[PDB]
Ligand binder design. Structure first.
Ligand SMILES: Nc1ncnc2c1ncn2[C@@H]1O[C@H](COP(=O)(O)OP(=O)(O)NP(=O)(O)O)[C@@H](O)[C@H]1O
Ligand SMILES: Nc1ncnc2c1ncn2[C@@H]1O[C@H](COP(=O)(O)OP(=O)(O)O)[C@@H](O)[C@H]1O
Ligand SMILES: [Mg+2]
Ligand SMILES: [Mg+2]
Lengths: 7, 139, 372, 747
């Protein structure tokens, strides 16, 4: 993703 | 009309009086006018008569004095020729066609009147010289 | 005439085809392989990279990337390869000639739609395109205007209610659990039985094991008692090399983590409690008619017995006096594609496309306002 | 002025659609009208309108309806009435169109001497007759060697078959002989039995367009006939509205059933079966269907279809009827099954040589193939019923096409055809109290046919103008295309109809709603009925027609699952069934789409050709010889589009005269001041005087073209002049007879 999760 | 004319017309009127009371019927008035040299249409005759009903036209009787204003009112060539040239272009007219149009158009006449007027005026082919017939009937 | 292309990026499998027919004529994994080992032989025709079924055929030597993780496109340079391969190799069609329809999960980052549009207009010169929610397309697929759609593929799980064709955006739930992180859990339990699968190729072996042997327990504790007390439950699978592996409680234990995500260690509750919480976020007048239609979609819902496990525990949550009906057609793996195949063939939908004129006028920002 | 004392006018009447009057007072401009009738009346001019003003009697009864110097419903109806009743003529020309009135009586006119009398003439030469159109076709072909169409239209029973028969009899008589005519005529009882149905208004209505081609060799002798068919009304096979039957063959078959061979088919009575039962009306007055069966089999035998094939056809029709009784029990909202040992399906399999277990499986399931993988999944009772009815329709349409191909095999002959003349029996524009998908398709085909007619007549008028050296821009044109685009364009009525079939939980209610959203204020020809939400109105070329939405989705749905026909193809019990099927997207097409394609193939076949037109009308409801009813005739002149052809012609220049015939009539009119040695310039001077404006009339090379009003006005003034002359003559003649009578009175 951009913050929380990895993608 | 002068006194002489009124006297001649009254005498003629009295010749048409078939009852002796000095009167004619309304329906004879037109006939008397025609006998005196006028050529009014049936419409003109009924108009000067006041568009009479059948009953008074056939049985009401008028003397010369009442007839006279009507004669006055009615009283007060090239078209005739063109009218005949309508039905022609060798200057002739079939007798059958002239008979049909005179007995079926306009103020229709009887077949006997047409036979009477046409007698001796048609040639062997059955053609009428209309200029001669017109001059003849106008003389 | 001219006929829309219909494409679903998903995660894992790509599935693509022409609108107005009944199943996709290209299906292949969205996978890019690059060769890592030293190449010795000279004049072998050795190649930059492989896509889809090529990469899995040769996957011994390769490293396998997935460019889409959790329904987000993480790498674009691979994804352009995957689309290029789909249109030219898989469909053998020039994309100038056909409008294209593209598919996405809800609540994913805005810029995913911008870039996914920009690449389709600028590089392919696709004459018009639309981007549609997976869940919405599953209703067109199953033939309803009403229902709560539970959808899980690889990557993202999401729930959307729809009532007579009005979506209820405040009640959409999304969960990252499904599909890949079941397999990453299955690796870790298989290690407990003495087998170790690390490489990206072994991850594809585990994924095939999962697809063959897993099934959802009707009661998890009863069946764990049975599998402890018995060998009756135990099944064996032959690895590609001909070694043979034998699997007990692990096969039901793996998909149970969909219902108890605490096993992998996520915060949130399982798919049933997000389904019930989603209905709870709907206004009380509709709820009966969402309980009366529940539509499962995408391949992670294919596990045997998952339907009756849902109906059983949702019934236990729900008010007692109501129908709970779970609808799960056997076709459901392709439902999102079939629904987009239906949608793109409607006549009303031909006004809906983003056309190239509109992109030139507005730039890719238009996709937000024109599309859902 | 237009209205005068002693004019005549038409005024409306309930008993006979128009009654005549004389106008008893001249018009004065304003509200009140005094009329005298065939007996005394007063009438209001106001709702402005003035009543249609009657033609002069010299024009009444003329062979050409455009010779009339007023054109109206009443003037046309009167000309046809007097020509039929007094002349006992049945043929009349309107413009290019020939109008044919069914006499229900034999006439001597068809004799071979009259056939030879028509041969080689032009049309204008000779008094109207059906032979004149075939003669024009034949010589147009001889000259210019484009193939020829002759097109015959009107409600069936207006005589379209006998109008074809005489054209065949003409070509066979003139060209020399090859026995086509008798063999083609012998085809009719089968193509009727498969193609004709009862309807609420009618019996033996042909529900399909039948195109016969007559072929010619390089001598222009008859080689042979070819036959094609178009626009089959497939939906009638599975559905009927109240007081309609299915196609005759189903009933003729049912009435056979007790006869020895058909016993093997286990047929019930005519209303045992779902497809025959629905309409209400298994029996017809004056038709013995069991008798007509014999004539059908005999017409098979004379065209060389053996009883081996004949019992195949009747087995297939028993197949369809038994199939219709198959009935589904729903075992879920999403699934259904055929209840065990279902007797209709048992008999259907025993007839068709297929396994009960695979029909029963495939009827309740449908099958989908990914490239690697295939899924077999259930379908609702509603889709199962739809798919069964689509199978029954698809069998029927294939059987019909096979019987047509075998008749083509009988009729074809070896010689390579140099050219053909082709004769089209097709149904006319139609309206009933209730209108439905059948009427919507019939009226759309009749709008394409009307668009051809209207454009061909326009083109011929541009030719006729420049042959007479007149500027085309005077010529006006009228266009169906706004309505055609309304029906068939993208976002049209048929488009959204085919959309609502695929849509999830589409229905007639949401379809009607989609129509009202798309068109209701945005298009001029589409109108919602004031008090209903389930109907719409189309303004057609002839008329406004109100359609109910209620049926269309269940009639327009067609899809056929491949697995069912892939079962039927397997059948090795009897020869014909795989011969029919052996023949992919088309199996998904709706009925409205298959109809629109069949209509495009028809319109291609006609646009290749040069047409000629015949229109037929059925003058009384009850087949009385040489009796006429104005109230049917006014209907059928609309149903044949004649009255819009008349409204088109009455604007512009409907009246045409040759200078010599004009001068022949009107020497009477003009005085010798103005006659010239050029009659043409003479007549130009005459009209320069006697009509105020050239805007009403034009001069060309050989003819004067007048707007509708002008000639009757001239006939007024000519007749009144003629009577003026008569009056003066006859009064003078009578006056001279009074002079003679006065001379007798003196004697
Ligand atoms: N010129 C004519 N001479 C004699 N009878 C005629 C003529 N025109 C029509 N008919 C009659 O019209 C009736 C019905 O016309 P016809 O077309 O023969 O009926 P059909 O066989 O059902 N064909 P159709 O109803 O038009 O599909 C028959 O009884 C014919 O005899
Ligand atoms: N028949 C099956 N049984 C169980 N799991 C499956 C099955 N088929 C696919 N899967 C798993 O589900 C995921 C693929 O689902 P899919 O619907 O193709 O994803 P997407 O919707 O992103 O295309 C993968 O993790 C795959 O292992
Ligand atoms: Mg007929
Ligand atoms: Mg007949």
């Amino acid at each position: 993703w951009x913050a929380x999760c990895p993608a | 009309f002068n006194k002489d004319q009124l006297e001649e017309f009254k005498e003629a009127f009295e010749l048409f009086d078939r009852v002796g009371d000095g009167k004619i019927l309304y329906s004879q008035c037109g006939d008397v006018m025609r006998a005196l040299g006028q050529n009014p249409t049936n419409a003109e005759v009924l108009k000067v008569l006041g568009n009479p009903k059948s009953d008074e036209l056939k049985s009401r009787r008028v003397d010369f004095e009442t007839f006279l204003p009507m004669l006055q009112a009615v009283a007060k060539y090239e078209d005739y020729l063109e009218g005949f040239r309508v039905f022609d272009g060798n200057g002739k007219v079939m007798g059958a066609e002239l008979r049909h149009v005179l007995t079926t158009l306009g103020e229709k006449m009887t077949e006997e009147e047409v036979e009477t007027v046409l007698a001796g005026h048609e040639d062997s082919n059955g053609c009428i010289n209309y200029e001669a017939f017109l001059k003849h009937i106008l003389s | 005439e001219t006929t829309a292309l219909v494409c679903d990026n998903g995660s894992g499998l790509v599935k693509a085809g022409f609108a107005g027919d009944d199943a996709p004529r290209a299906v292949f994994p969205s996978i890019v392989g690059r060769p890592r080992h030293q190449g010795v032989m000279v004049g072998m025709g050795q190649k930059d990279s492989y896509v889809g079924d090529e990469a899995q055929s040769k996957r011994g030597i390769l490293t396998l990337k997935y460019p889409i993780e959790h329904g987000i496109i993480t790498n674009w340079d691979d994804m352009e390869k995957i689309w290029h391969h789909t249109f030219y190799n898989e469909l053998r069609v020039a994309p100038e000639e056909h409008p294209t329809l593209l598919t996405e999960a809800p609540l994913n980052p805005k810029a995913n739609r911008e870039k996914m549009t920009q690449i389709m207009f600028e590089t392919f010169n696709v004459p018009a395109m639309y981007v549609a929610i997976q869940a919405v397309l599953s209703l067109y697929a199953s033939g309803r205007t009403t229902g709560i759609v539970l959808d899980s593929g690889d990557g993202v799980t999401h729930n959307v209610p729809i009532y007579e064709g009005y979506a209820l955006p405040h009640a959409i739930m999304r969960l990252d659990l499904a599909g890949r992180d079941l397999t990453d859990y299955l690796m870790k339990i298989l290690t407990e039985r003495g087998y170790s699968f690390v490489t990206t190729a072994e991850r594809e072996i585990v994924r095939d094991i999962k697809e063959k042997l897993c099934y959802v327990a009707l009661d998890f504790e009863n069946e764990m008692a049975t599998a402890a007390s018995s060998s009756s439950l135990e099944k064996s699978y032959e690895l590609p090399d001909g070694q043979v592996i034998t699997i007990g409680n692990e096969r039901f234990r793996c998909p149970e983590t969909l219902f108890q995500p605490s096993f992998i260690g996520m915060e949130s509750a399982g798919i049933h409690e997000t389904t019930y919480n989603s209905i709870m976020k709907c206004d009380i007048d509709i709820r009966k008619d969402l309980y009366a239609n529940n539509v499962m979609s995408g391949g992670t819902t294919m596990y045997p017995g998952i339907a009756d496990r849902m109906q059983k525990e949702i019934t236990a949550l729900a008010p007692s006096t109501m129908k709970i009906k779970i609808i799960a057609p056997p076709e459901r793996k392709y439902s999102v594609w079939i629904g987009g195949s239906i949608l793109a063939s409607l006549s009303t939908f031909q006004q809906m496309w983003i056309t190239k004129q509109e992109y030139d006028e507005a730039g890719p920002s238009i996709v937000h306002r024109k599309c859902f | 002025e237009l209205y005068t004392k002693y004019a005549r006018v038409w005024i409306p009447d309930p008993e006979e659609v128009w009654k005549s009057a004389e106008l008893l007072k001249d018009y004065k401009p304003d509200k009140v009208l005094q009329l005298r009738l065939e007996k005394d009346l007063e009438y209001c001019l106001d709702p402005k309108e003035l009543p249609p003003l009657r033609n002069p009697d010299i024009l009444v009864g003329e062979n050409d309806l455009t010779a009339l110097s007023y054109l109206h419903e009443p003037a046309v109806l009167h000309n046809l009435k007097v020509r039929f009743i007094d002349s006992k003529l049945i043929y009349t020309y309107c413009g290019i169109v020939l109008v044919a009135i069914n006499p229900y009586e034999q006439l001597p006119i068809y004799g071979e001497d009259i056939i030879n009398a028509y041969s080689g003439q032009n049309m204008g030469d000779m008094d109207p007759h059906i032979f004149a159109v075939a003669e024009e076709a034949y010589k147009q072909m001889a000259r210019d060697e484009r193939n020829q169409s002759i097109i015959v239209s009107g409600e069936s029973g207006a005589g379209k078959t006998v109008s074809a028969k005489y054209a065949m009899r003409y070509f066979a008589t003139v060209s020399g002989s090859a026995n086509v005519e008798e063999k083609v005529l012998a085809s009719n009882p089968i193509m009727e039995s498969i193609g004709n149905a009862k309807t609420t208004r009618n019996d033996n209505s042909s529900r399909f367009g039948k195109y016969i081609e007559i072929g010619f060799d390089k001598r222009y002798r008859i080689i042979g006939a070819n036959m094609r068919t178009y626009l089959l009304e497939k939906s009638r096979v599975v559905f009927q509205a109240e007081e309609e039957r299915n196609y005759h063959i189903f009933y003729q078959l049912c009435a056979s059933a007790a006869l020895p061979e058909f016993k093997t088919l286990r047929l019930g009575n005519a209303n045992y079966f779902h497809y025959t039962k629905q309409g209400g009306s298994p029996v017809i007055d004056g038709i013995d269907d069991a008798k007509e069966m014999v004539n059908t089999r005999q017409a098979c035998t004379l065209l060389g279809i053996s009883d081996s094939y004949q019992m195949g056809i009747f087995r297939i029709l028993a197949g369809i009827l038994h199939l219709g009784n198959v009935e589904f029990a729903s075992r879920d909202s999403d699934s259904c099954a055929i209840p065990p040992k279902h007797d209709p399906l048992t008999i259907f399999c025993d007839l068709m040589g297929v396994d009960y277990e695979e029909m029963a499986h495939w009827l309740c399931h449908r099958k989908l193939a990914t490239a690697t993988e295939t899924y077999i999944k259930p379908i609702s009772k509603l889709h199962a019923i739809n798919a069964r009815d689509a199978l029954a329709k698809h069998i029927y349409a294939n059987l019909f096409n096979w019987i047509v191909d075998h008749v083509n095999k009988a009729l074809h002959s070896t010689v390579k055809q140099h050219s053909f003349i082709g004769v089209l029996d097709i149904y006319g524009f139609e309206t009933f109290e209730i209108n439905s998908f059948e009427q919507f398709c019939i009226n759309y085909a009749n709008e394409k046919l009307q668009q051809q007619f209207n454009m061909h007549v326009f083109k011929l008028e541009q030719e006729e103008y420049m042959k007479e050296q007149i500027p085309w821009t005077l010529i006006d044109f009228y266009d169906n295309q706004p309505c055609i685009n309304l029906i068939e364009a993208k976002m049209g009525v048929l488009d959204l109809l085919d959309e609502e079939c695929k849509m999830p939980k589409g229905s007639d209610d949401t379809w009607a709603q989609k129509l009202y959203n798309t068109h209701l204020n945005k298009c001029a020809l589409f109108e919602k009925p004031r008090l209903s939400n389930k109907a719409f109105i189309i303004k057609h070329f002839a008329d406004k027609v109100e359609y109910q939405c209620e049926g269309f989705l269940e009639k327009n749905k067609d899809t056929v699952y491949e697995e069912q026909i892939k079962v039927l193809k397997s059948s090795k019990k009897f020869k014909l069934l795989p011969e029919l099927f052996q023949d992919s997207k088309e199996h998904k097409k709706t009925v409205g789409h298959q109809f629109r394609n069949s209509l495009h193939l028809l319109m291609e076949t006609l646009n290749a050709t040069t047409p000629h037109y015949v229109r037929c009308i059925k003058p009384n409801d009850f087949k009385f010889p040489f009796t006429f009813d104005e109230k049917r005739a006014v209907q059928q002149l609309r149903a044949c589009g004649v009255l819009e052809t008349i409204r088109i012609s009455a604007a512009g220049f409907p009246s045409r005269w040759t200078y010599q015939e004009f001068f022949s009539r009107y020497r009477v009119l003009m005085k010798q001041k103005d006659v010239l040695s050029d009659r043409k310039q003479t007549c130009k001077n005459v009209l320069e005087k006697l009509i105020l404006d050239k805007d009403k009339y034009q001069f060309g090379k050989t003819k004067i073209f007048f707007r509708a009003g002008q000639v009757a006005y001239l006939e007024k003034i000519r007749a009144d002049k003629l009577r003026a002359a008569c009056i003066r003559i006859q009064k003078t003649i009578r006056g001279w007879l009074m002079r003679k009578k006065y001379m007798r009175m003196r004697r």
